[PDB]
């Protein structure tokens, strides 16, 4: 909607940095609204949803099992691993790892899952093999959040990410069961409260994944809609701002308020 675009442009100015935005109809896949849709931005933690989509693809192919248990040591732990740091003795199953990666943005969970598929290069291969020739993961957590200007490593574009997210959640690439599990993990996201969720009215559905990185990078991908079901996909990214986390969160929440108001 025009008013949401106004807010996206406001945000870009107030933050003094680029903001990327796109809104897709979930059923048709058509672009409803956009700003800098083809420009690159660091994915940050939003890649974790793509990673679990690759894992679910392997589950569908019989090459992986959600109940398989993965053991690891203190040597595998990296920063921001609130869930995995509590399970060094018992380990965690693949589904528990996807749940921790998506709902808590657990970094070690993401690295362990990347190991199951062969690393960043194999996640990029998975993306290329499903039609996304733009998105690329090059590094592991936490280095993938470096966000060096003009560096294309670990980046996506709002349009490629929204298109890929839609493919993972709808269609046939993944089985009905896997599509439902992926969106259920996103619905249970626990760490994106200050973003789109802050402006969400009671009764609305939201399945999301946020991201934060160096050099003011911040973003979120989501499937949301009124009456408890999603009907649109929204992707928002920004990088380069000197603004505080609170201000970057507020700008994204205000884009959300506009999206909701003019739905």
Ligand X SMILES: O=C(Cc1cccs1)N[C@H](B(O)O)c1cccc(C(=O)O)c1
Q: Closest distance between ligand X and the C-beta of residue 108, in Å?
A: 10
Smaller CB separation from ligand X, 96 or 189? 189
How many residues are recorded in the chain?
Answer: 263
Q: Is 64 a catalytic residue?
A: no
Residue 217 is labelled as binding a ligand: no
Structure-token pair, residue 114: 């990347």
Known binding residue 9? Answer is no
DSSP state of 2: H
Within a 10 A sphere around the Cβ of 43, how many other Cβ atoms?
29
**Given 3, 85, 143, 152, the catalytic residue:** 143
CB 240 within 8 A of CB 17: yes
Is 209 annotated in some ligand binding site?
yes
Question: What is the closest distance, in whole angstroms, from the C-beta atom of residue 87 to ligand X in the complex?
Answer: 18
**Residue whose beta carbon is closest to ligand X:** 45
Cis peptide before 244 (omega within 30 of 0): no
Q: Which parts of this chain interact with ligand X (CB under 6 A)?
A: 44-45, 79-80, 105, 107, 141-142, 145, 191, 210-216, 240-242
Q: Give the span between the Cα atoms of 137 and 152, in whole angstroms.
A: 9
33 is catalytic: no
Give the count of beta carbons closer than 10 Å to the beta carbon of residue 229.
11
3-state helix, strand, coil in the chain (%, to 5): 45, 15, 40
Nearer to ligand X, 182 or 212 (CB): 212
Closest CB to ligand X among residues 116, 145: 145
**Local structure of residue 201 (DSSP, 8 states):** P
Least Å from the CB of residue 191 to ligand X = 5
Please, what is the minimum distance in Å from the beta carbon of residue 212 to ligand X? 4
How far is Cα 172 from Cα 179, in angstroms, rounded to an integer? 9
Which of 12, 23, 33, 45 is catalytic? The answer is 45
Report the distance separating Cα 228 and Cα 205, nearest Å.
4
Tell me which residues are annotated as active site.
45, 143
Binding residues: 209-211
């Amino acid at each position: 909607h025009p008013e949401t675009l106004v807010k996206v442009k406001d945000a870009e100015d107030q933050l003094g940095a680029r903001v990327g935005y796109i809104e897709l109809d979930l059923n048709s896949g058509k672009i409803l609204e956009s700003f800098r849709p083809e420009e690159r931005f660091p994915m940050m933690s939003t890649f974790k949803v793509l990673l679990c989509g690759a894992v679910l693809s392997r589950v569908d192919a019989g090459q992986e099992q959600l109940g398989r248990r993965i053991h690891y040591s203190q040597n595998d732990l990296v920063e921001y691993s609130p869930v995995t740091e509590k399970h060094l003795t018992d380990g965690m199953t693949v589904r528990e790892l996807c749940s921790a990666a998506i709902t808590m943005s657990d970094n070690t969970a993401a690295n362990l899952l990347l190991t199951t598929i062969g690393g960043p290069k194999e996640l990029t291969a998975f993306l290329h093999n499903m039609g996304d020739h733009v998105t690329r993961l090059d590094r592991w957590e936490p280095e993938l959040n470096e966000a060096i200007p003009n560096d294309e490593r670990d980046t996506t574009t709002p349009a490629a990410m929204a298109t890929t997210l839609r493919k993972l959640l709808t269609g046939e690439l993944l089985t009905l069961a896997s599509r439902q599990q992926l969106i259920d993990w996103m619905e249970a996201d626990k760490v994106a409260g200050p973003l789109l969720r802050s402006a969400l009215p009671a009764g609305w559905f939201i399945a999301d994944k946020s991201g934060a990185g160096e050099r003011g990078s911040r973003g979120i991908i989501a499937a949301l809609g009124p009456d408890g079901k999603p009907s649109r996909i929204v992707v928002i990214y920004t990088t380069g701002s000197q603004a505080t986390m609170d201000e970057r969160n507020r700008q994204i929440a205000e884009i959300g308020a506009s999206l909701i108001k003019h739905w």
